[PDB]
Amino acid sequence: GPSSVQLSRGDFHSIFTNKQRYDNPTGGVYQVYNTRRKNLIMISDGIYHMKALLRNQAASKFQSMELQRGDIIRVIIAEPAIVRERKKYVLLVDDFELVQSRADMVNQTSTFLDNYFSEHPNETL
């Protein structure tokens, strides 16, 4: 069914351009974009998609929740990671809650965050 919550549109851009958000990148509402490093997934903020590494309690919930594309989550504990040498971005997620199971994708044609910052190198923290 359709997503009955609003995603945190553009928040992946905010996490890596606004220092206050970078320092505490929590509370965002995101949609799972793809799953498969069995704990590395792709998530969507409705505008961008980016890689997230699920660790600790988030890795446990990945398993217990059978997390899949379309699920909507709220991130509770997280930290940003930039691999500068490779221009790669990852959200390290230690805990999240499930908001909605198997919602229709809000955006099927989002921009990959790494691609966005590689062509706008000026913007990144």
Phi, psi of 119 (to 5 degrees): -85, -10
Sorted by where each starts, the structural domains of the chain and their CATH numbers stand as 11-104 (2.40.50.140)
- Asked if 105 and 69 count as a contact pair (C-beta separation under 8 A), the reply is yes
User: If DSSP states are collapsed to H, E and C, what string results for 50-69?
Assistant: EEEEECCHHHHHHHHCCCCC
CB 116 within 8 A of CB 13: yes
